[PDB]
Amino acid sequence: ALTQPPSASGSPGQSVTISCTGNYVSWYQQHPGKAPKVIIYEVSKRPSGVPDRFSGSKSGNTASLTVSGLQADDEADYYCSSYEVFGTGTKVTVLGQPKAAPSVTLFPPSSEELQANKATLVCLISDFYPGAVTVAWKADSSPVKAGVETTTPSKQSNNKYAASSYLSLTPEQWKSHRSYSCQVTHEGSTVEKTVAPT
Amino acid sequence: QVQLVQSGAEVKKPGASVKVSCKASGYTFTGHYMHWVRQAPGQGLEWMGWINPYSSGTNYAQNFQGRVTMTRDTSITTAYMELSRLRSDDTAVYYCARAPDYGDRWDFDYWGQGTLVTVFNQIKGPSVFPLAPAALGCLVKDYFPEPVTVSWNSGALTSGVHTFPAVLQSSGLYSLSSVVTVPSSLGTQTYICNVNHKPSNTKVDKKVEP
């Protein structure tokens, strides 16, 4: 019930400001492979050892964390929290190369898979930086969550990122809807591909 | 020095139970509530419940009530979290996390290192389907375990091939898609993907034609 932007990014020396929309709010930083760590508590207070370039505030229904003077080790996932509730999380990238927009290719199910009484939509996403994207599937303009499996992004040989997302459907679901869409958003910019039976 | 040390990574099948241990030292074990928090791969944090190690009283998150058991053993200052009836979407890193003091019970100040619990289905060879075009490919669907090898045209085709890392699905099975970029040229050149899954001795060739 605490919503955060999916991602944020800045170069070394810049800042990122991360909102948390719904009492107190606290903030955690989580490096890859590590446990989260509290960096702000009671809206704006810093635990011992946290540098003063981390700050927090709250106005009305919205709290925000700012990491100023960005350093490479600030690249992490950030979560707000209030009692047992965690925010949806923000992946923060400290920019190390030019940004790049995702390329998206969407395949419909094959005849052979439909003959096996199965159906899979395949959405392939490549050549993007920062390495964070939001993938949303739609059945005729309505969101579908069941049947979705999405990879975490992975480095390509050209140092940009790739990811893939799959939608499992019954043949009846595929043939009954007019179209299906894979929508991928990258720092608030959305592109979409659409496929349809026949 | 406060330390919370968890048990090592676990690999389970659907229907199993897992019990993660969290060995505490360096503070009053019965003096701090211990919480459990999990995180599915690539997803966010989710609180599972707390145990009060003094009384062994508990408060589980409603969506785990009936399936989770939190216990402790003060003689070895260890807290435990047992999750039953595992499905593959319970694949996640499971953390124990300490309440800081009597008044602040939620700004978790010390955490265990995490315990990865992965829930896999039975060994199974892939089904392979064409991804018709330009970009064309092969869908390598519902296999376990890793890895599979995908070549094109028996190795005659090597450049232009991007084989995407597999996804672990909620079925406990993996699925990837190897695609090739071509100029289109589609009517002349024949494209066949060769998929080998040695753990199941599955080998399959599939022609990809518009």
Added chain:
Amino acid sequence: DTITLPCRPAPPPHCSSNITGLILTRQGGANTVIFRPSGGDWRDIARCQIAGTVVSTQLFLNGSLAEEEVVIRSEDWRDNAKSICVQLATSVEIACTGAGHCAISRAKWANTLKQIASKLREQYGAKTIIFKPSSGGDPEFVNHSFNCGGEFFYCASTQLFASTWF
């Protein structure tokens, strides 16, 4: 459907390549002009400056391509003792089976030669362009020959150069 070249020893599938160009000799001495795979040597190929890392004769493999259309060059068009460098714009895959042959799309090879003939025609005027097999040579030059994977392979190219374009 395929022009199948017999090769010795048998190139494996991972030694398949893109044909990105070729090198020809114009026959010296009826409004027709005859071209054959080059009677030159490594010096002719080097002067073309369109090869890749692959050492090969009569055909450039995994080399540079032209942008829009076939480009043909010569140090001297009137000199039948100097080779003609042909740079293709779209590569022609040559796929080896590992059983002793390497295969080329007959349809795409005919379309490639047609464009080459058109470029040659706008250089020599004339009407009829004829491709004929090698006049002869040592094994590495009378065959389309190339190195791959520590081996040197010899492919007879007779079927690649026997066609008339009017």
